[PDB]
């Protein structure tokens, strides 16, 4: 299955957001990060990707389709807007096994707040 996430200067949750900021998918599903507004990208957050996955980083303004295979939680950021909290979580499967590893990863405050909210929205 294929899902879409919009990269926005602003949205429901305020300044510099992924919409949605949380997404539950199955192994092998894809997510396309869409540069609806200019100036954004998507990058994995260190400490927030499960065993068997590979970190990535898209180019600014790249329409970017990512396959999520290994189960668990994936934290993503927009590289320039990470400090400002432009972050999201993609969760592959239920009962993610890397949850406490990812909860311990270090993030700047606005990012941490939005990451915790996305984790809670996903049932964690």
Q: Which two tokens stand for residue 15?
A: 């300044």
2: which 2 tokens? 């294929």
Min dist CB 63 to Cu ion, Å, is 14
Beta strand extents in the chain (DSSP E only): 2-11, 14-19, 22-25, 29-34, 43-44, 64-68, 72-77, 87-92
- Residue 104 Cβ vs Cu ion, minimum distance, rounded to whole Å: 25
Is there binding between residue 110 and Cu ion (CB under 5 A)? no
Question: With b meaning 16 or more CB within 10 Å and e meaning fewer, what string describes 61-89?
Answer: eeebebebebbbbbbbbbeebbebbbbbb
Determine the interface stretch with Cu ion among 36-44, 47-55, 87-95, 112-120 (rule: CB under 5 A).
36-44
Has 6 been labeled as part of a binding site? no
* Stretch in the footprint of Cu ion (CB under 5 A) among 28-36, 54-62, 84-92, 113-121: 84-92
Size of the site for Cu ion (CB under 5 A): 5
Residue of minimal Cβ distance to Cu ion: 78
Residue 78 found at the interface with Cu ion (CB under 5 A): yes
Residues making up the annotated binding site for Cu cation are 40, 78, 81, 86
């Amino acid at each position: 299955a294929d899902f879409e996430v919009h990269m926005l200067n602003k949205g429901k949750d305020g300044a510099v957001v992924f919409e949605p900021a949380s997404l539950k998918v199955a192994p092998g599903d894809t997510v396309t990060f869409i540069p609806t507004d200019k100036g954004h990208n998507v990058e994995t957050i260190k400490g927030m990707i499960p065993d068997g996955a590979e970190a990535f980083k898209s180019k600014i303004n790249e329409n970017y389709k990512v396959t999520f295979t290994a189960p668990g939680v994936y934290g993503v950021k927009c590289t320039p807007h990470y400090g400002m909290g432009m972050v999201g979580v993609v969760q592959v499967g239920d009962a993610p096994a890397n949850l406490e590893a990812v909860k311990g990863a270090k993030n700047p405050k606005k990012a941490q707040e939005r990451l915790d909210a996305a984790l809670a929205a996903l049932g964690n």
